[PDB]
């Protein structure tokens, strides 16, 4: 199959404003949210019907318990970071853990933290160490690296457990995740400011979101600037994007092993 990923995020907010949770934890398979938990609901809930349909109540009940523990731990860790930095008021703490199953069968794993939305600690599962961005992160790194059992446990979770969870979830959501919805592509030609013609290459209705679009002048890649539009969710499970140039021109689109040419 194509490359797929499993990730879980955690967000801790010290001193939240009214109506903002103190703790949120959300899971994703690729671009799809799969699970959700916050300090308000205090429950782990499915975010995909295929997650709800395939995991029995005991899964949700068990993880709700673990998340209530993780919630408390996150708060304590943000308080310790704030004291180290000597910061008052509202500050954020974040975590992203995950893995990828590449098309070739090879795998990647990641575990990282942020303080006020900036990189804080990066786990290196290959050297079994933490990369500290500053002196406070260094204090944490020294404490965490002294726990050898935790470093080893983490590498096994990243490399083995995560990949097995990803494979399980991929099977559950195969009708959503493993499908292909090809793009509908068009080219729009227009004279803009007098003398300057803009050519837009617009694609929509596609799934997965990963799409390559470029512009070529006589079979060779452009030497001028191409403006790229972001891959945006249309709201129906499909995506849209574009690529434009000014000025023999052709738009090239690659999506899920299928290549397309629109000669202008």
């Amino acid at each position, epitope marked *: 199959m194509r490359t797929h990923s499993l990730r879980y995020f955690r967000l801790g907010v010290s001193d939240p404003i009214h109506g903002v949770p103190e703790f949120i934890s959300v899971g994703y398979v690729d671009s799809h949210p799969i699970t959700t938990y916050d300090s308000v609901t205090r429950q782990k809930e499915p975010r995909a019907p295929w997650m709800a349909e395939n995991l029995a109540p005991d*899964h949700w*009940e*068990r*993880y709700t*318990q*673990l998340l*209530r*523990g993780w*919630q*408390q*731990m996150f708060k304590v860790e943000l308080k310790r970071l704030q004291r180290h930095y000597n910061h008052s008021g509202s500050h954020t703490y974040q975590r992203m853990i995950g893995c990828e199953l590449l098309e070739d069968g090879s795998t990647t794993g990641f575990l990282q933290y942020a303080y006020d939305g900036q990189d804080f600690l990066i786990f290196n599962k290959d050297t079994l160490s933490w990369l500290a961005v500053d002196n406070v992160a260094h204090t944490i790194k020294q404490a965490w690296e002294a*726990n*050898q*059992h*935790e*470093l*080893l*446990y*983490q*590498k*096994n*979770w990243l490399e*083995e*457990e995560c990949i*097995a*969870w990803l494979k399980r979830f991929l099977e559950y959501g195969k009708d959503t995740l493993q499908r292909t919805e090809p793009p509908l592509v068009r080219v729009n030609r227009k004279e803009t400011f007098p003398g300057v013609t803009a050519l837009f290459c617009k694609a929509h209705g596609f799934y997965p979101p990963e799409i390559y679009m470029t512009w070529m002048k006589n079979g060779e890649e452009i030497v001028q600037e191409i403006d790229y539009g972001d891959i945006l969710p249309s709201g129906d499970g499909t995506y849209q994007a574009w690529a434009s140039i000014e000025l023999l021109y052709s738009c090239h689109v690659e999506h899920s092993g299928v290549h397309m040419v629109l000669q202008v």
Partner: antibody
Amino acid sequence: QNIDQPTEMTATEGAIVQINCTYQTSGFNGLFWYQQHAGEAPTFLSYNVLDGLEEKGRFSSFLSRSKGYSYLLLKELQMKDSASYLCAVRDSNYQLIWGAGTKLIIKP
Amino acid sequence: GVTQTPKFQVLKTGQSMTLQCAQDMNHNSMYWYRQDPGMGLRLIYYSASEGTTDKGEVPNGYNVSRLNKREFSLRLESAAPSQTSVYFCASSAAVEGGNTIYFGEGSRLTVLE
């Protein structure tokens, strides 16, 4: 689902003993070895999560994830080593599943 | 580490009982197990942090209270002879690897008609 370890093992003092533990669990988050002397609380001996042998004095703990198996090796056996050795595994949902334990009798 | 009381108890069938457990290791995770001959420890109830508790494998005939972060009580509402066992309170910082489980000294309960 299952943690299997022998009910009892008898070895001679000064000798070596290997207490086996095979697990058949849904996921794996590490294996523990605990020692429990008769009428006392269990106490931690080791934790294994990656493959290989860890040597802590006269005691060694081995893990093979592909084989779903571990062993606790006790060298230069002493009478004080007569205890029950408990094997425990954290599964994919972090549930700590405990084996029935192995009673180790040392022959003087 | 993990302090539990009482070490021994004789109860008459139908009597209520409370086993107390305290840890001063600033641990989040807390457990109540029963140890019976021929089998591994069976989790009765557990508490993942202060403010939460959930059933284990054998919760029937028992209830718990995570009183605060330090204390986790086990209650037998109406003692039955099948509840004759050795009870262990345990604690850990978290559920992930890198967090050793610590046990109390044990509580032997004998329930008689």
